[model samples]
Target: ASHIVGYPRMGPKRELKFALESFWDGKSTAEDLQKVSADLRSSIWKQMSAAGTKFIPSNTFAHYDQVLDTTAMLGAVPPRYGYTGGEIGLDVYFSMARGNASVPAMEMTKWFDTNYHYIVPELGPEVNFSYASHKAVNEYKEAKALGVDTVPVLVGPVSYLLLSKAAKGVDKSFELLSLLPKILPIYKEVITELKAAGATWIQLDEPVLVMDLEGQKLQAFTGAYAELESTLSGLNVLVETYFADIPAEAYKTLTSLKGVTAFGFDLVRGTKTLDLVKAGFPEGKYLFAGVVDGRNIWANDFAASLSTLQALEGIVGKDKLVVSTSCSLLHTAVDLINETKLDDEIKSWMAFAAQKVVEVNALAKALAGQKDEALFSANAAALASRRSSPRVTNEGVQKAAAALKGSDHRRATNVSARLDAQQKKLNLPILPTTTIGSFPQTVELREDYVKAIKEEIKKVVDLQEELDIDVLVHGEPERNDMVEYFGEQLSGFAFTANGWVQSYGSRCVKPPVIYGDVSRPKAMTVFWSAMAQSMTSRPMKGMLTGPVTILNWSFVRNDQPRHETCYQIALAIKDEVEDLEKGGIGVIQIDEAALREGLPLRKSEHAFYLDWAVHSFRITNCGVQDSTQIHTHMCYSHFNDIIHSIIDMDADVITIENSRSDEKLLSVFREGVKYGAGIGPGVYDIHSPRIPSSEEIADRVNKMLAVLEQNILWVNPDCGLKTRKYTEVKPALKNMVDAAKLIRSQ
Candidate 1:
């Protein structure tokens, strides 16, 4: 029996995003959102069961993120989100994800090693851990009502506690192991409730096991599971880990633990996992082999995967083996078969979530000694074609990479000379206010820009000049999306019309597919910046996506070394940067938002990643003149770990998001290297439209003044204002300037 561990909750068009956003817009009620979520859950569950999935997963779907859902379920709402004692409603849940008029959203960081973002769980010491919600139980009952029984998936209590942070008074060094016992009662009650509801199996996810664990964390995993196995008497518990392979010691510790029925490992992405597994698998226990890839677009090589499974059958035995995806299918798109526009030749090269379910089920059938001849033949042919396809390889790109020599990577001039020309030319005062670029990107604004009307860009230029901005930007009115826009103009990338994957809560991105040589086909944004600069006198800058950012955000080629592909992309961006300079653009900002996310999740592989990533940035922007200011923007990453590599990139100025962290992100700037780049620690959060008062902005700016040099300070929002409305952007930027003015007056 094949278990569909989890499937996409969004409707084919992603109705969940619309319904959730509508609720936020005051267009839908909690009841309405719940109905949409409920109906979608049942529909997907029924669909999976019909598709031959033996143990489908329910309660795995989320309105936002699983971690936040777990937080809400545990009744551990942060004080800032303003939950006043009762069952935390959707209002507070959303307020925790998206900010309200008063409260800012809880911080969101990347989930595991994947690009999918999850709300960071905030743990308060006083939280009385009890069974908070009937979502897990109710979801199980909902599935049974439709005659489809499913396994209930949950973020395991240990992992939930482990992934969370100490809210305030308790030190981060204070281990959650001592504190986590308080929450174990909730797991017992929840497990009992699910078992009482006739749910036979529970899939508990504990992905943190993949990380480097030490003394207390390891014991916590041991104690947590030991207690669960002893206490939960009526139901089967499958404690699974994904997104990482278990380390050597962790593997032995996991196998020795009692009570849990099955252990799952993501073998596809966790390279070298099979070697570890082949060494010794636990006897007499079910071994859930995650042979199929869940994170990539590539299809499983049916023949090879079957051969590996047969070998595993010899060791673990057919009765104890379960064929499954490496992790959740949520990493890939909802469906690949939905693409009607793509040719069969190209579409054959990919597989999304829907197709993955079918493939896994077929593998199960094949293991049962029945083969679907036509399906197997077609799949085998596609696999062969994908390998032999000439479309994926580019000789020119390989030669360009090979031809690279030990040329001096640094710019001929240093930061002092560049800043002198920039300061002398611009002649701005203390606390100079600028945006992180990008004005509002509304539906009507997008339509107007597409039609060649200047209304959108004109409004942006006028608004900034009126606000007395020191450095003007075009607001990227003409660009569709940061990555897709650049990918379309590059020689080797392919854009998918419906290839959407979740970025965060209610947000999905269709990442461009990098297929071949990444050379610029023509000047992409020159006419854009040139026209915007022509319309304004206030130092309008050019906007380009950095090479590393492009590669990180896109689905890159599987064949080439990532270093070579990154160099090729850098060459393309280098053209755009120089072209922008050629058009007399005064400044250029290349955003590498995914730089930190792209680095290996394991710290051991960071040096190799940083070498290429830092060099990619250097190659992209280092060719510019001293006066042509090179600025880079990073959004949503904790800069604390990567500050050294950031210094290594050596851009003239760096703007980063800081409002959400209460200015604590500024502390990272002071460590080790005296970070040479001019710093613009954003004074307000841009992830939401909530208006920040001048006092709030002023207070943030003042904090920065204490740590940063006043002369080099740039006042701005945390990131781009694209998601915000003009009504929001206007007052926000106005308050930003007002704060800087008040600082100068002081």
Candidate 2:
């Protein structure tokens, strides 16, 4: 009967996103903002509470992201700011979440290993902690007025302090953990306020308990909880931990905490913790069992979940047991009810946030012997149908997967051989910079692509004419999303009309669902690339998302090994690579932007993941001959660790994300790491709206030239141009090509 941790803030079809964005752009008022958020909260609370949830969550929602709000509340704002006085409040908050109109946004990295991105909080020695936002308390009261009692959720102070990065020269953000004595009073005020406002229990999410901690950090945890227990006398704290199994030492400390009224452990991930539960929980503490998977779209294995709970019932009894999701449902889509296009059988095998609430409730009923019928009959039927589906076990794909040997994963030759062939084929300069394929998708072109699919539109032809650059592109106006576009055409994929997950601030993507065996029915991008190539004499880059990326971006099938599924995608892409080569497309760039993002969260599990991941990339691109310059682009370029495997891929040219990180990312390449193929570290940040001057581009080129051999370099943008406007992109590329010419002149 425990609560859902949180619901998806992105409303059905991302209505909340559009509303919030409109408010930020001055097109709407605060009332517009209030209405959308209010409606979303009302819908969430009503649905969760109606499903017989004992503990409903409030204020877990955010206008932007909860992590960013936490940063502002703690007064850990970065130094750079343009606003003053009263304007400072909202402006500074948004600026941290997203940078000013001119500057690039603050660095956003993945939240743990998940696709959700959190704005990294910047901390310094002189940081001050304060209770700046009353969002949690306000929302709790808002829900109460609607006749629904809710428990407010807040990020634990210990977890917040641990995840943060201290400004340069500070050893650790936890050095300021001593300041928790000061911060604990502020948290006490918030808890006391929430309790006084008719809240019985509060959820404090401390995910850092999964991390390896010792010495001072261990002591800090003890100190923080002791103060919190003493100060917040009336409130019951449900401490939550997830992502992985809690370390034994950390669990020992947590089990002994005086303040914690209950313990929330991820049964899906931390199944080992069940043994600890059987041994006997602390006296008077509730056991919040997280059995449903929150991170994936797969249907709940309710039979398995109920069995686990039944064992716990013998230990903790039903009165003290609370069934829940392993983590927040933010990682999932909004609802499964809206997906009418999917086969009912397939739809039965999936659950979004709204549906998950029902699953959890059903589980509680089944465990308490209140429900006579089987809990997951629909899910079991779906599992049977999926196993018997002909589309899942296609003979052609199965044969290809079976035929995949170790040698099939290797390139035709080593990097040196391919580099020599590529050099002889196309003469280029050192630090030869180029972008990751896309030109800006103009509004006019987009409208044309949508309107005139089969019709011969002059606008489409004319737009292609005006897009002039060294490495020519088709300007992807026809496609809304890179993965979604391919997913629509290929077999074994499903699309939703309203399933949207946020990529960044205002941008959201409904990633395709890989339900069965993947194969190409027809050439995916052949016609577009061929038309673009026929117009240009220069090398037209035939673009495709790499095998790893396609797998990473989609909701992959849970039946097979991920590598087997990846290899199926690789075979499909390999066919396209050969077709592009045959169609006179000289340079083909397969982008693996999500490769590093797809890496397992734990370092111990990285090797098995990277091995198959690298193999998948090579298998996709290996069929192309040496004369056809095969290029690979990676945007999340923390290449210091994966550089060796990257070199092993043996691509003729590799362009990486280097603009925001500066040329310092290339330092690893300079330090005796041999990459015989061409290397192009991006020179300009494409994420920014500002166009770099020719001198700025030249300075970046000059810096690369200092370490890299001139013959191996190529000049390009850091990433794709899909997000930028034409006004920004045209001038940026013109400046970029001009800079290349000037460098040659010097």
Candidate 3:
């Protein structure tokens, strides 16, 4: 059967985005959001079914995130959300995702290595699991009402626990996997109800199988599934895994499970899974061979994907083979039809979620000997054109990066010497106060474009002086998204008018498409930064998105190695860094928020990724002098693991999102990593609506001072204030600056 592991929930034209925003803004009702969700679900089902997808998956749609959805299903809402709980409604659901005025939201991080983010589940010792949400059963029945049967998809019990962390204020020693026994009963209940609701198959997504599992983690899988086996008599379960190849032991545990009638593996990324399959297969179970690349925008190379599927057919037999996507289509854009402004040649070489459904079905038909020569030929033509396209390569840019030496990746002086030079030049106070580059980009500021931006920059400069901020920014009113802003001024990049993908909650980012060799046309941020500097006596920090971040966040070109493309982008950014320096912008902030998120799933492959990633970052700012005071910001990363590589980047200052992590990141520094650069651990959560008082900010600073030296510590918000209102941002910065003064006086 032709199968789709999941479909994109946001509509082709982002109807769901509009609906969600309106509802969140209180401009619409709960029923309004529900109605739009219902409509989107129906449309998605019809689209997939009409394209001849035999195993269309349901419950893959999420109002916020699927992990949070599973958390609600298990009734694991933290006590802080005040869920006295019967049914998990939208109020509680969205509060858990976006935080209300009263409580902070749960922690959010990247989903696997994808650009997508999910709310990290919070598990306490006293946490209880119950059959709280029937969303899986209801969505299945909802699709059945539309005369289409869907294979219900859910976050598997073991992975759900594995993704969680011990809740705040709980003892850090608590083990989350122990709650597996409590959560499995809820899963069994949900599955039994789904079976009762006419669902023939269920797709339990166990994506963590792609990770390096310990003996205890491997045991949890068997323990959870062994009990679930009793509940699966007439219904079939597809235990699906994706992103990368599973470990040998994980493969053994999954295939040997008596309840699992089918297995799904990502052949696009998990090419090593083929060897595991060749090793052996169970007698009658199905192999859902994921041949279509679901996470990228590239169209399928039918010749290559078909050959792999045909080989898998030989190994697993033809009748037991099912063509599927590499993973959920959520990571890719919604539809290609909406990209009317994209170049025709590039557009033809791409596929969105909708197009992938068709590709899966087409491959399935071709495997069944019903091959349409026209369809196959058209696919071959696009692939061949992309391979030979002149737009995909530039010898000049390639050779320029190739000509770089080791000196190009290193600053002239050591970190201590650089810090001394910077302090002597700028002469800032102890525990310096600054922001993570952006201020709120209100709709009011965008009304008249350039004129309003200049006026707004003056106001921002004047306000920072009043707040006694040590450093300042231009507020970035003219830019759209960080990566898109830089990508627009560079060659070998393409933009789509309506190519929006969900970042998290109501936030959707339109990532630029990198199609070829990249080079800067000219200085992108110099004009604004220099102008902002002219209006202020304080050091105005010029901001640019780092090369690694630009590459990680964009639809990077696949024709060449990722490092080569990243180096090309680095050279372009290197030009901008030099221009910003010459333009007299004394301090510059380059954001690499997605650096750690782009790490490979396998530990064995991490060194190579970090090597290229760190070099790409260093290549951006290494040529600048010591007194220039370079800064970088990273959000939602576990810095403990990658501390060495982060230090190797050698920036003068590093601001990170740490308010939500509760100074847990500081423990790494306390453990004697001996970090020499300036550290700005954010004192307040910008993702939350609750404003921090001066006392609250001071307490956080004190927590930092307990581990870090007062001179090297900087004070800031967790991230850019682009998504915040002025009311929250104004008071937040005021509190931050006040806290720094409080610390200095003490």
Candidate 4:
């Protein structure tokens, strides 16, 4: 049977997001949420079946994240949750994801270099393993009751442990792989139950194989799969890997597993994995060859995909070969049909999750000598049209970008020189206070939009003054989203009406489709920045989204290299930065929040990515004068590895999140990484609802001062406050300022 790695769980209009939000808001019941989830699952299955997808995977519909579901399934709840023994309910589940009134939520990070985030399991030495949820079995039977056979998907044991972190009291040298023996029995039990429920094929996703692995981890993977091999008799288990190419040694270990009957390889991203498959495939085993790209919006080149599949079929035989998506369709929008605003020309060049399913089916039929001539021809035409289209090439923009020199990306003055220039112009107090760039969003700016936008900025100006924030922001009330707001004003980007993909829990972002050469039409943020500066005596920050982030957050064009598109976006932002400086905006912040997450999964690939990513950022801020005060904000953690690149961006000041992780992020500065930019490590978390007391905030400031220079420190929150409520935002900033004042007096 032809297979899909997984399907998108969010409905076309994001019914799941609405349902989850309604339940979390306490306006709806758990029963009501489950009903919506069931309906979403049924519709998803119906569409896949209609698209002629075989071996549809169940248990891929997760309410929050797939990792959290696996966390519940294994009952690996932290001791802080106070669970003794019993089936974990929704109460504890929600508590684990989002903390209750008593405890904070578990740490969340990007899922294997994708925009999607997963809950980080906090494993202690004392965690117990048991079957806590029957979601896999229930969902499989639920699909069957609706007259569809399905495959159950699970996060394989080795990958699960590798993604988790040790608990607070655990030693820094603690190995998560040590817990493999305890959790293997739980995995076997789940697999045994699925087999009892009449499942034929099961998918265990082990995407961690794509990473550079050590010998010890490889040994753990082999031993863990061997232990689970005893439970499998009739079931055909496909050990799946995706996102990037597997290391050669890891690929050998994976193909040698005795329990695995089939293997899924991402042929699109993992090009090297194809070479290994051609060299040798296990005899009589199935190869789920992922040909259709699941992460992007571009339509598949059906002819090219079929050519690859035909080669694989020649090696593995027709009956054992199956065409599949490169990875889960979870990264893509649900359907392309609902994008009513897109023109037919661009629409012809695009494919959402539903369209991808059809692409897989078409490839499979073509391999079996049942060619769909019309479909194949249309796909070929679309690919040709996009490549040669005048809309995709901007000679003027391309020439300008290519003509750039090294001097263009470097600031005119050194950090020491810029520090003196900025301090003389702005005259900021020691331990200056600032918000990350936005306040809580006000929903009243709909009618008379332009007039109301000015009024909103004035309100934000007054509020910041009241809070005594040092470097002020315009609050960005007129913008809908950081990337979308800029993309709408830029050329070569298109919007969608119903295209939505999950960013995190109950949060969905409609990433604008970047289909051509990107260039800004006009100044996106200058008008608002000028108006806000007019309303306030303090310096108003001209907030702009940075090049790398705008590129990473959007559905980028696959025709050109990512770094080229980023350079085009960088030039566009350079124009905006110069405009804002001319418009009398003293300070400007360009956010590269998604920078760290866009790093390639493999360490060897890091240098090339960081080169363009940092240079693109430098292009935006370097075009302006030192006194203009270039600032960049990165919200994600783990900056220790990328500290040099962060410094290379050469912003006058940088703000990063330090509130969430237990690790001392400031230790990078203490341990001899000389960063010249003014740095602000957030004193309190903005994502949580709880407000910190003044003393708590003060302690964090002192901790930062211990490892960082006092004069270079600035006080702020972890990230933007747009997702927070004013009820929470008001006091949080007040406490932050209070902490700044307390430390200043001492």
The reply for model 2, stretches above 4 Å from the true place, is 72-107, 167-176, 214-216, 232-235, 275-284, 372-375, 400-404, 407-412, 423-434, 441-471, 504-506, 670-672, 737-746
RMSD of each: 3.9, 3.7, 3.5, 3.1
Per-residue lDDT tens digits for candidate 4, residues 1-746, read 57889887767778887887788879898999889999999988877887778879899998888999999999987777788867887788888888888887788988888888899988867777888888989999999999998989889899999998887887777777899989888887888888999898898999998898887788788988888778888778898999999887899999999789999988888989988877877878988899788898889888777777777767878489888999888888777898768888888989988888888898878877788899978888998888878888766355454545553555567778888988888888887777787766555634465665666666665656676677777777777778778887777888888878887888887878787788877777777778778777777788888888888888887777898888888888888989988888888877888887677898889899999888788777666767788778897666777788887788778788768775365677656667766887777888878888888877777887777788787877888787887787665666777767765676
The per-residue C-alpha lDDT of model 4 at residue 653 equals 80
| List of clashing residue pairs for candidate 3 | none
What is candidate 3's TM-score against the reference?
0.89
- Cα lDDT of model 1 overall? 0.77
Per residue, candidate 3 scores C-alpha lDDT tens digits across 268-303 of: 888998898798878878999897888888888888
lDDT of 2: 0.74
TM-score of 2: 0.90
Structural similarity to truth (TM-score) of each candidate: 0.87, 0.90, 0.89, 0.91
- lDDT of candidate 1 over 528-618, digit per residue (tens): 7887777766767678888887888777766568888888888777788899889888788778876776766566877999888888888
The residue ranges of model 1 lying beyond 4 angstroms of the native Cα positions read 19-35, 72-108, 169-175, 232-236, 417-433, 441-453, 456-470, 535-538, 560-563, 636-638, 659-672, 683-706, 710-717, 723-746
Q: After aligning candidate 2 to the native by TM-score, how far in Å is the CA of 114 from where it should be?
A: 2.2
Best-performing candidate as measured by TM-score: 4
Provide the lDDT at 492 for model 2: 77
lDDT of 2 at 332: 76
